[PDB]
Design a protein around this motif. Structure first.
Motif, PDB file in Angstrom:
ATOM      1  N   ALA A   1       0.795  -1.219   0.000  1.00 27.10           N
ATOM      2  CA  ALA A   1       0.000   0.000   0.000  1.00 27.10           C
ATOM      3  C   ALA A   1       0.831   1.274   0.000  1.00 27.10           C
ATOM      4  N   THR A   2       2.162   1.160  -0.073  1.00 27.14           N
ATOM      5  CA  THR A   2       3.115   2.279  -0.072  1.00 27.14           C
ATOM      6  C   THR A   2       2.944   3.190   1.138  1.00 27.14           C
TER       7      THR A   2
ATOM      8  N   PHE B   1     -10.719   4.836  -1.187  1.00 29.98           N
ATOM      9  CA  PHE B   1     -10.051   5.441  -2.331  1.00 29.98           C
ATOM     10  C   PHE B   1     -10.502   4.846  -3.658  1.00 29.98           C
TER      11      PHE B   1
ATOM     12  N   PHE C   1      -4.345  17.255  -5.299  1.00 28.35           N
ATOM     13  CA  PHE C   1      -4.260  16.056  -6.119  1.00 28.35           C
ATOM     14  C   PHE C   1      -5.600  15.663  -6.728  1.00 28.35           C
TER      15      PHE C   1
ATOM     16  N   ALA D   1      -3.783   8.464   4.386  1.00 28.48           N
ATOM     17  CA  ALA D   1      -3.180   9.121   3.235  1.00 28.48           C
ATOM     18  C   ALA D   1      -1.911   8.444   2.739  1.00 28.48           C
ATOM     19  N   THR D   2      -1.524   7.311   3.336  1.00 19.49           N
ATOM     20  CA  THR D   2      -0.324   6.535   2.996  1.00 19.49           C
ATOM     21  C   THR D   2       0.949   7.372   3.056  1.00 19.49           C
TER      22      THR D   2
ATOM     23  N   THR E   1       7.193   6.109  -3.640  1.00 21.65           N
ATOM     24  CA  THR E   1       6.642   6.824  -2.482  1.00 21.65           C
ATOM     25  C   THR E   1       6.338   5.896  -1.313  1.00 21.65           C
TER      26      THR E   1
ATOM     27  N   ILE F   1      11.012   6.486  -5.395  1.00 22.08           N
ATOM     28  CA  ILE F   1      10.190   6.697  -6.583  1.00 22.08           C
ATOM     29  C   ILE F   1       8.778   6.172  -6.360  1.00 22.08           C
TER      30      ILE F   1
ATOM     31  N   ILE G   1       6.997  12.321  -9.854  1.00 21.79           N
ATOM     32  CA  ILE G   1       5.631  12.744 -10.150  1.00 21.79           C
ATOM     33  C   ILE G   1       5.467  13.081 -11.630  1.00 21.79           C
TER      34      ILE G   1
ATOM     35  N   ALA H   1       4.060  14.775  -1.358  1.00 19.56           N
ATOM     36  CA  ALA H   1       4.154  13.624  -2.244  1.00 19.56           C
ATOM     37  C   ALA H   1       3.867  12.297  -1.558  1.00 19.56           C
TER      38      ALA H   1
ATOM     39  N   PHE I   1      -1.262  -2.689  -9.269  1.00 15.87           N
ATOM     40  CA  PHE I   1      -1.986  -1.427  -9.260  1.00 15.87           C
ATOM     41  C   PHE I   1      -2.238  -0.881 -10.660  1.00 15.87           C
TER      42      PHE I   1
ATOM     43  N   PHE J   1       5.153   9.673 -13.349  1.00 14.82           N
ATOM     44  CA  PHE J   1       3.842   9.135 -13.018  1.00 14.82           C
ATOM     45  C   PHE J   1       2.707   9.885 -13.701  1.00 14.82           C
TER      46      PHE J   1
ATOM     47  N   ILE K   1       3.326  -2.188  -8.115  1.00 18.80           N
ATOM     48  CA  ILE K   1       2.954  -1.234  -9.154  1.00 18.80           C
ATOM     49  C   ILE K   1       2.333  -1.941 -10.356  1.00 18.80           C
TER      50      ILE K   1
HETATM   51  C1  LIG Z   1      -4.270   9.793  -0.220  1.00 12.41           C
HETATM   52  C2  LIG Z   1      -3.952   9.289  -1.630  1.00 12.41           C
HETATM   53  C3  LIG Z   1      -2.550   8.678  -1.646  1.00 12.41           C
HETATM   54  C4  LIG Z   1      -2.230   8.172  -3.056  1.00 12.41           C
HETATM   55  C5  LIG Z   1      -0.829   7.560  -3.073  1.00 12.41           C
HETATM   56  N1  LIG Z   1      -0.525   7.076  -4.426  1.00 12.41           N
HETATM   57  C6  LIG Z   1       0.822   6.488  -4.442  1.00 12.41           C
HETATM   58  C7  LIG Z   1       1.140   5.984  -5.851  1.00 12.41           C
HETATM   59  C8  LIG Z   1       2.542   5.371  -5.869  1.00 12.41           C
HETATM   60  C9  LIG Z   1       2.861   4.867  -7.278  1.00 12.41           C
HETATM   61  C10 LIG Z   1       4.263   4.255  -7.296  1.00 12.41           C
HETATM   62  C11 LIG Z   1      -0.580   8.197  -5.372  1.00 12.41           C
HETATM   63  C12 LIG Z   1       0.444   9.257  -4.968  1.00 12.41           C
HETATM   64  C13 LIG Z   1       0.385  10.427  -5.953  1.00 12.41           C
HETATM   65  C14 LIG Z   1       1.410  11.488  -5.548  1.00 12.41           C
HETATM   66  C15 LIG Z   1       1.352  12.657  -6.533  1.00 12.41           C
HETATM   67  C16 LIG Z   1      -1.508   6.057  -4.815  1.00 12.41           C
HETATM   68  C17 LIG Z   1      -1.449   4.889  -3.829  1.00 12.41           C
HETATM   69  C18 LIG Z   1      -2.474   3.827  -4.233  1.00 12.41           C
HETATM   70  C19 LIG Z   1      -2.413   2.659  -3.249  1.00 12.41           C
HETATM   71  C20 LIG Z   1      -3.439   1.598  -3.653  1.00 12.41           C
END
Ligand SMILES: [C][C][C][C][C]N([C][C][C][C][C])([C][C][C][C][C])[C][C][C][C][C]
Ligand SMILES: CCCCCCCC/C=C\CCCCCCCC(=O)O[C@H](COC(=O)CCCCCCCCCCCCCCC)COP(=O)(O)OC[C@@H](O)CO
Ligand SMILES: CCCCCCCC/C=C\CCCCCCCC(=O)O[C@H](COC(=O)CCCCCCCCCCCCCCC)COP(=O)(O)OC[C@@H](O)CO
Ligand SMILES: CCCCCCCC/C=C\CCCCCCCC(=O)O[C@H](COC(=O)CCCCCCCCCCCCCCC)COP(=O)(O)OC[C@@H](O)CO
Ligand SMILES: CCCCCCCC/C=C\CCCCCCCC(=O)O[C@H](COC(=O)CCCCCCCCCCCCCCC)COP(=O)(O)OC[C@@H](O)CO
Ligand SMILES: [K+]
Ligand SMILES: [K+]
Lengths: 317, 317, 317, 168, 317
Positions: free
Chosen positions: A39-40, B68, E68, B39-40, C40, C38, C65, E39, A68, C68, A65
């Motif tokens: 889930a980063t 999300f 965002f 918000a990770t 995140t 990269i 970013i 970010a 996702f 992406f 990735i």
């Molecule tokens: C509160 C909302 C958060 C979102 C985070 N992300 C990360 C992606 C990474 C790729 C390698 C987006 C960021 C954007 C910055 C400008 C999405 C996550 C998704 C998980 C399932």
């Protein structure tokens, strides 16, 4: 469709088995770490010090990735397909008390200003009809209304009442014969065009047949000399300038259950010209003097909008 | 629509109550931790050591990805629906000084090269008209221009001026009669086709009626022998090769307020043939010798583009 | 298309070379750090203390970013283009045992209720045909069925059988002549309209030619007086109310290999009127008394649906 | 306009229009003019075959249902299509024949087993019909009367031998 | 459009000023922290301990998700608008060596099999023409080819050559007169229909006028008796079964510069019937015996495809 969940479970099993047998942590710690890494989020409390594990997390990140990027692509394909199919009809009705309107003309536009917007489903086939329906606030279902297989996509079996108004009389007769094959108890209101087709629309199975062109053909040929009945028909049924043709139901109790029309004397008390009484799917116009009212009957009368209020309180208990 | 905010608040209350009564931290610390976890971001300063809490964060993460994935799906459905409805008309005009053009022909394309692009709204119904309008730089509103319920979607009540040019004369008369029911003070410019319909377009309520076909029918039948007035009408009103028909307003002050046309002597000073004077929604062509100018009047004259500059400085103070 | 991978590799090489020569860490540590930065994730175990590196990570984040935002834009452009092209036909068939239906009429709608939905590809050109095909559960391929270059987009070379039913006879003859140029062994079922075109459809290369209008033209002119053969043809071939025209194959073994029709005696044992025997792409209607059955033959007979079961077990071993 | 063509007192009225709804509406008008005339319709869809019978048609011939069931069964095998195209459409070798039984001619009161019709003539007897009712595959306990209609499939060589066998 | 960058800079200035004056860190540390927090990386090396700052980071996170969610919505609106406008034409050509084909018929489909796919732009207005162009591999530009304002959207000023083939002759003459107003040096190839319009198409400004219907009208009336020239014209210009009509240029050097046709003797050496010589935008059919070749000339001749190779090496040095 369901391979996305398979790939997600595959990458979770890959991450757990990779972290547990390299870092040497517990199974719950590896489970928590791969649910934080996929889930980063990255709490960073159990980061791998081993460069073999540091190379393993790169594979886990690129696979995360990858999942996702396949899941977002599948969701976008599903959403674009569903919102392009919903735009041009092509959808199945799921409601259960809706009103299906077969065809589209001026007489169905005027019956849309006294109903709701989400309650009606217009079942037609032309292309500008879709834009007129989406402007008037209804829902458009693309389908041939004479075809039985397209009468079920509008869900005519679980409908409240069906209103048939097509471009000819032959399609009206065929649409009634197609509806009566599916559900024999639903209520059908049909619009005739020629005078000779009223008995055909009744024998096909319609419950109420309206013929506006016969009414205009009789009112045009009797308005050449004087035109007095056309003024009454227009000012009462069309515009309702000062009068109105309303009906009132007799409730339970209702203070008049059992009296005759001579003893009730509705006209000289209220001011409403009593036309007929609705005793159970029949109309006795000009009831005789010995007719006794009952419970649940319907009194049809003409009156000013200040006399309907004087009648509706005279009939309530 | 609004259930997304309910689900977001539900998962925030779930995360706070889950972290506070398991980790034993403060309420603000749990609030900060769930706003960092949802918000990770993952600062990792308050990670749970307890395996019960480690199993709880998995539920919080899957619920956060669930919210999300519902919010992005709702935003994408809203955006695709709004940008498919905006493409084929089907939108309500929100401006307040715009110009509504009912119908579309060559005479409305030539009045689009002297106006702005975002100021005009073309109200028509055909399909290739939409592509011609989107190429010419206007905005297309799908609607029947004779229908009163579709004249309000273009917001004709708060419009600057309305330009009516439809395919027949009957629809022009009906469109003027439909506009004058909504707003009685808006300015209507109409295009007649037959000679007999000019008085009908004026009695319907138009403020300015132009009839190009009558002008061409008179200029064709007087250009068989010599054709001298057609050269003047073409070179002055159509092409403006060397002359131009312009009007000039008289400002406040203006150094000529009170003099007569004999004492002003505009033609032999400037070089502009003075046709008429615009005293308040009327035209006095060939004004008499005793006419005295006032403030705010409009002088209509023919002149070369170097003589209009000599006139506009003669009239200013 | 492939520049996205180039930009991703460029930002990975930029991040590795930036972190390694500023922080002074190992190459694997820098590789792991840029694959965590990269994506995140942010484990935070190797954060840069140097303000030069702290300014470098800002450039790495804005570049990440940027990649992406270019990759998501490319994926969305590809998905919208692919799902707008797939909607209105415009696609190449990739299957290998499908059934191509050229044209669309009532006789191809009735052969769609005995086949699968994903197995059929309707190759037509009109616009309402696309909506009827998408309602009936088939796949629509936009193309002119007489054109050879559009007969290959439906993949007629690797098709199971092709069904030709167009609006005229001339297009049917041209579609058969176009199919027989591509694959000389595929099976073509064609629908004739006039009586004079049956020999033309057979000489063009069709394997089975059906002519329904000739059957109706013969049954209408022989049902004026009595109409007895029309009842048989209707109740057997059209509705199958109480009888059915079925065929049965003779399997390997089959307990009757070698006997004659006099010694088999199928009718008085089973109850099936034996019409003919299918010995290898020919039909011997009313076989003689000395005809001996073989392996793989096809027995064509008329019988009630309870007698077909009595025949299918009499023929099996 | 149906009375301008004089549909009252005619042999038969043959109805086939551009769609099914006009066919149903035409039959419903002919049954208002003349209740006893013979109407031969033509159904387009399968779902409208009972509608034409309830509307008042005496004989419904649906070619598109026939061709739609024949297209879906000739993808692999294609032997039913050969039979119908050789007997009902083109009549290349065989043809379907209907013959009446004249009065007092060799067959009144005898059963079908001792009629010996498949072996002395060669026609395949599909069925026999009496009074607008078709008895496909009549059993051995059945008798012929004067006025029956025998429905058979045979060559023109054998149809004439049947018509001479049916004579007095 | 550009307010997104303003909102991004506003939230960066808000985050820096919020972190610096509450946590008391340096300006670079606050800059690095807000570029890591916006970010959602979250290194966690500078997390706020103060509950006032812990409440501030919640506002920063919700504002970051807000930016965002506005930026992704703007990108999706821009992408959907750009890919719906690109689908149905409605685009401006940016190339500089392309070939514009005005109109669409069979003779422009056959000239598309000898050109590239991305080099051609078909400028038409109908709706099925768009699908035929997108199937044949060209690019479709919606526009009226007679209108001058829509001839510039295909960029006819910077085009290689323009091919005019419209449904009538009047639109061909008007399209040539519209192209010659924009660029007087571009090459126009036009298709005539009637015999009387060839001089009109040449006087309008076409460089090459082809008239296929006159060729067929002459070949049909001379093939009634014997038909010998039609076999030559078909087998040489149409199919090229065994011969071919090719032209060869004379390069620099070329071993024959200065000799006469008597001294070159191309036919009895090579086998190519020499028709004419292309000396600078003119054709001398059957050149005389004293004609001397030069550099850059074009030799037009008929020959088998094994004799063109024997000629192309005889002419090269
Ligand atoms: C509160 C909302 C958060 C979102 C985070 N992300 C990360 C992606 C990474 C790729 C390698 C987006 C960021 C954007 C910055 C400008 C999405 C996550 C998704 C998980 C399932
Ligand atoms: C890290 C990556 C992990 C997971 C991917 C993220 C989940 C995204 C879900 C993708 C959503 C999606 O595929 O679209 C449809 C349902 O849409 C929706 O509203 C579904 C809402 C999504 C809720 C499920 C998310 C739980 C994933 C928990 C995983 C955590 C690890 C599926 O329709 P399908 O085409 O099947 O045909 C239906 C007939
Ligand atoms: C973690 C997940 C948390 C939140 C989800 C992210 C927010 C995404 C918002 C989704 C945006 C959305 O639903 O689209 C429409 C408005 O679009 C927009 O520009 C709205 C812009 C979004 C700004 C609001 C974001 C604050 C969420 C703060 C939550 C932090 C915790 C709503 O139109 P609705 O269909 O209602 O009909 C309108 C008649
Ligand atoms: C951090 C950012 C890093 C990477 C970007 C994220 C990857 C997103 C991939 C974008 C997906 C994409 O561009 O769409 C098409 C394929 O779609 C897809 O299902 C492709 C599925 C994506 C799987 C590849 C992801 C690995 C990236 C690993 C990078 C980690 C660092 C490409 O079709 P193309 O227009 O080429 O024409 C084809 C004829
Ligand atoms: C955290 C959030 C921060 C930033 C938002 C993310 C950036 C997303 C950019 C949104 C992309 C976008 O708005 O679309 C168009 C350009 O598309 C594109 O390929 C643009 C590619 C995006 C590259 C720019 C990203 C740098 C943002 C760096 C910010 C870091 C802090 C703009 O076309 P506009 O409608 O203007 O009309 C044009 C005539
Ligand atoms: K993150
Ligand atoms: K997205």
């Amino acid at each position: 469709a369901t391979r996305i969940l398979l790939l997600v479970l595959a990458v979770i099993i890959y991450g757990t088995a990779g972290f547990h047998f390299i870092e040497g942590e517990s199974w719950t710690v590896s489970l928590y770490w791969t649910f934080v890494t996929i889930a980063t989020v990255g709490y960073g409390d159990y980061s791998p010090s081993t460069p073999l594990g540091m190379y393993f997390t790169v594979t886990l990140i690129v696979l995360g990735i990858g999942t996702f990027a396949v899941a977002v692509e599948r969701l976008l394909e599903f959403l674009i397909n569903r919102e392009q199919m919903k735009l041009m009809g092509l959808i199945d009705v799921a409601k259960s008390r809706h009103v299906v309107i077969c065809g589209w003309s001026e007489s169905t536009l005027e019956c849309l200003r006294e109903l709701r917007g989400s309650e009606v489903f217009v079942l037609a086939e032309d292309e500008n009809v879709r834009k007129k329906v989406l402007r008037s606030g209804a829902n458009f279902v693309h389908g041939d209304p004479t075809r039985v297989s397209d009468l079920e996509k509008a869900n005519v079996r679980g409908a409240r009442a069906v209103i048939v108004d097509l471009e000819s009389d032959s399609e009206t007769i065929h649409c009634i014969l197609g509806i009566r094959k599916i559900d024999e108890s639903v209520r059908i209101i049909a619009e005739a065009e020629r005078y000779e087709n009223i008995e055909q629309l009744r024998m096909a199975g319609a419950d109420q047949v309206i013929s506006p062109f016969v009414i205009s053909g009789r009112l045009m040929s009797r308005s050449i000399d004087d035109g007095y009945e056309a003024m009454f028909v227009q000012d009462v049924l069309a515009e309702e300038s000062t009068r109105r043709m309303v009906e009132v139901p007799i409730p339970e109790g209702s203070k008049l259950e059992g009296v005759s029309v001579l003893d009730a004397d509705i006209h000289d008390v209220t001011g409403v010209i009593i036309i007929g009484v609705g005793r159970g799917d029949e109309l006795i116009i000009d009831p005789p003097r010995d007719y006794s009212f009952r419970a649940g009957d319907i009194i049809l009368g003409i009156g000013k909008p200040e006399e309907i209020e004087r009648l509706k309180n005279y009939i309530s208990a």
